[PDB]
Amino acid sequence: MALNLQDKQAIVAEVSEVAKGALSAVVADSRGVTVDKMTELRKAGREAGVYMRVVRNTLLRRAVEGTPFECLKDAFVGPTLIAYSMEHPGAAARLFKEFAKANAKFEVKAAAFEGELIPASQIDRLATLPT
Amino acid sequence: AKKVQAYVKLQVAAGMANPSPPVGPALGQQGVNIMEFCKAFNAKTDSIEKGLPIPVVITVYADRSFTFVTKTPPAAVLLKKAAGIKSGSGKPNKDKVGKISRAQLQEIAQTKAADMTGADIEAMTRSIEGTARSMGLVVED
Amino acid sequence: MFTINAEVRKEQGKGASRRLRAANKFPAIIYGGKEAPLAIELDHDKVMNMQAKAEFYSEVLTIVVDGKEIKVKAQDVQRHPYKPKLQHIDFVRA
Amino acid sequence: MLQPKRTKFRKMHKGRNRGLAQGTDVSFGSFGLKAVGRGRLTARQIEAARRAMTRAVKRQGKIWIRVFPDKPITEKPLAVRMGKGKGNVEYWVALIQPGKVLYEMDGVPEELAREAFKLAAAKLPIKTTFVTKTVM
Amino acid sequence: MKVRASVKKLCRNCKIVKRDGVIRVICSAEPKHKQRQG
RNA sequence: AGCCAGGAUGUUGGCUUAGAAGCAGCCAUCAUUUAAAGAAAGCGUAAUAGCUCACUGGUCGAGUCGGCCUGCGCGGAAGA
Ligand SMILES: [Mg+2]
Ligand SMILES: [Mg+2]
Ligand SMILES: [Mg+2]
Ligand SMILES: [Zn+2]
């Protein structure tokens, strides 16, 4: 029931998870195999977190209307499709790891796996934790 | 492979891996013979389903053989052997379609959580529980 | 809450009533209580849409005639013999 | 074929068929086949429409026949002159006026009843409509 | 083709067209479904 | 509407237990996996394949879909 207000609520409910957790991801729509796509989504929902929602309400208007409360640079709805997956175990978690590793492996596309850094001051791998 | 390349779905219970004598020649599109039917399935399906429902993979790989990722014991063979009542659909309204208890589902999960998984291990348990209970009956235990 | 706008009927009888129904209205009567019955005319399509609801015939209706609001109840309805039309409606007061 | 058992008079005047009908409401079931036209409904037509309804809805629910023929129609045999008394009763008809509910159906989904009434209406010489029961 | 007085869509692929004042049924799936006159 | 695409590996379904084959008879049976898995749509429907009930995402930017009443038309409409 993707209605006017329903998609208005969908954007806010999908942006709340991003503002409360870590960077999310997406998945495009070019070609999908039964076993390949399901197992990848099954593995993604296991490692990154069971709260992953492949639902997509990221239209060029709905995304910029609700989500833009924080990080007003969220007008990149140019993706071919969206399949979201949160990262509870810290930032740049297995969600980011799986998306960055499956962007060119065992998948068609992942909407370039741009990511959503919380401060967005600069783009960094954040792969170093000196200790 | 679990994703059978030639998924001609006609295969007798896991006692004899995909018995063509019981499937007949209507599923003759498969090319299974003694080279790739009695080597892996007939040797690795003993503790999965002994005379119980377990489909046999008819996949043929590209390496002149048939060998790829299989899965854990069938849910329809574990949750029913741990239940006793071998009934199901078709006659699920007149009588019980089998027993689907918490213990039966837990045992099915503990047996089929190796490779047959979903969004999580408990999700695979939910798949096992649904595979046992959706036959038409579920036990209140 | 159902609000019906009514007009007091000037002429009454067979000829006048048929002229109303040709004019896409239909006659109605408000009786009951202590005061005299009031013959009104209602605009057919709005009342027909409202009466499509089952609760039209159970709740208390308000009829706006001459500015004065009247709490009424649908007492009886005369339907067209074979058409989805209303010929006449009885309204008991309160 | 409906027919009155033990009627009082064998033959009846032709009469006329003026006026609107009386049983114009869905009284017994929830859906009705209402006649918007005027004419005669023979016993054969009533039976044929009933069978079409009873087969479209596979003998499920309840079907009421609100009309009963009870009017004998006479015909003269072929190659007989005019006069020499009134003809022999050949069949029975029910006089139908516009608004007459002919059939009622209950215990059936609305769209299935609509299709069942469509099949029955194709068997009838009078134009008909589908009607549902109303509060008051 | 069929030249019945009553022409309808017999399946989903039937389309009703009105070429030259005649109401026709053209089907891309079943040539038996070709009907001529409204 | 068209276009960028998709929709089981418990599942010959526990299933009339030789399946009646991800959608013959077969009963229900998302069964997390949902931009999708219906245990069923035309292909293969007894069956692989690439299209694909439905279902959305993506594009792209004003309406779109069915009914009801009513005016005037159309077909039904062939003779010496
Ligand atoms: Mg007069
Ligand atoms: Mg021409
Ligand atoms: Mg004409
Ligand atoms: Zn057709």
Side-chain angles (χ1 to χ4, degrees), chain A residues 2 10 13 19 21-22 25 28 32 44-45 48-49 63 66 68 75 78-79 83 89-93 100 102 104 110-112 115 119-120 127 130, chain B residues 1 6 13-15 17 19 21-22 24-26 28 31 40 43 51 53 55 62 73-76 82-84 88 90 92 98 103 109 113-114 118-119 123 130 132 136, chain C, chain D, chain E:
Chain C
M1 174 39 153
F2 300 91
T3 296
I4 316 188
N5 310 296
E7 307 50 69
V8 158
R9 294 185 69 202
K10 309 55 55 183
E11 37 170 28
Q12 69 81 60
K14 178 179 270 190
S17 298
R18 278 167 190 226
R19 282 193 285 276
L20 278 180
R21 299 201 200 82
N24 182 283
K25 309 191 91 223
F26 67 101
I29 187 72
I30 299 173
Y31 56 83
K34 302 290 99 176
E35 61 275 65
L38 186 61
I40 51 164
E41 34 167 89
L42 308 175
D43 157 70
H44 174 275
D45 35 13
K46 278 146 156 57
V47 180
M48 191 78 189
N49 301 322
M50 287 188 3
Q51 71 94 37
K53 295 61 172 295
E55 58 274 23
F56 180 90
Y57 302 100
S58 34
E59 313 173 28
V60 161
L61 319 175
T62 181
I63 287 188
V64 183
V65 60
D66 194 73
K68 168 213 202 305
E69 310 319 11
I70 312 185
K71 309 334 289 303
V72 302
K73 197 158 271 313
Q75 170 70 19
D76 206 322
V77 170
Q78 282 183 20
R79 304 200 133 84
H80 186 286
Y82 61 80
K83 274 172 194 181
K85 309 214 91 213
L86 309 173
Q87 282 190 328
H88 189 248
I89 299 184
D90 287 1
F91 285 117
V92 284
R93 280 194 191 79
Chain D
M1 269 207 333
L2 304 175
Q3 177 175 336
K5 63 181 76 69
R6 194 233 83 61
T7 206
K8 190 196 302 172
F9 292 108
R10 298 185 317 140
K11 302 149 157 46
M12 173 174 309
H13 286 348
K14 188 202 305 306
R16 298 301 178 261
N17 199 21
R18 302 186 42 198
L20 305 155
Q22 285 314 127
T24 77
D25 293 291
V26 179
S27 291
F28 297 104
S30 61
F31 322 107
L33 189 58
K34 176 177 283 189
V36 306
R38 168 188 322 272
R40 299 178 168 175
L41 269 190
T42 70
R44 291 193 173 281
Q45 290 156 3
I46 294 162
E47 193 32 25
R50 189 203 64 77
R51 297 187 174 184
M53 267 173 296
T54 309
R55 216 178 297 104
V57 175
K58 302 134 181 253
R59 293 216 271 181
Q60 300 308 312
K62 204 165 189 317
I63 272 170
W64 293 262
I65 310 205
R66 300 283 307 280
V67 299
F68 191 87
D70 82 326
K71 191 205 205 307
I73 299 307
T74 67
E75 280 164 347
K76 296 191 100 52
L78 210 86
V80 305
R81 302 263 163 98
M82 293 291 102
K84 313 293 177 182
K86 192 163 172 75
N88 304 298
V89 176
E90 307 304 333
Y91 58 101
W92 294 77
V93 304
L95 292 186
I96 300 304
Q97 297 84 36
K100 198 47 163 285
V101 173
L102 313 162
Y103 298 99
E104 319 224 22
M105 176 174 296
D106 218 19
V108 161
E110 214 251 8
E111 79 313 327
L112 170 61
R114 280 184 178 275
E115 193 248 2
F117 279 153
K118 265 205 58 182
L119 302 185
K123 260 76 189 178
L124 296 176
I126 292 148
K127 204 110 190 63
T128 50
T129 38
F130 175 92
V131 293
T132 78
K133 79 178 141 201
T134 55
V135 193
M136 209 162 30
Chain E
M1 91 167 67
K2 310 150 136 43
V3 189
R4 35 200 55 162
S6 165
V7 292
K8 316 142 154 303
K9 299 179 207 263
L10 311 172
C11 44
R12 324 160 308 82
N13 312 111
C14 291
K15 272 154 28 83
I16 300 277
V17 70
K18 200 203 173 185
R19 297 170 179 162
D20 170 87
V22 189
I23 275 145
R24 305 174 171 273
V25 191
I26 62 172
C27 194
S28 45
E30 188 35 286
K32 287 175 159 198
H33 287 187
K34 217 166 70 175
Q35 307 159 76
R36 190 202 181 274
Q37 81 183 358

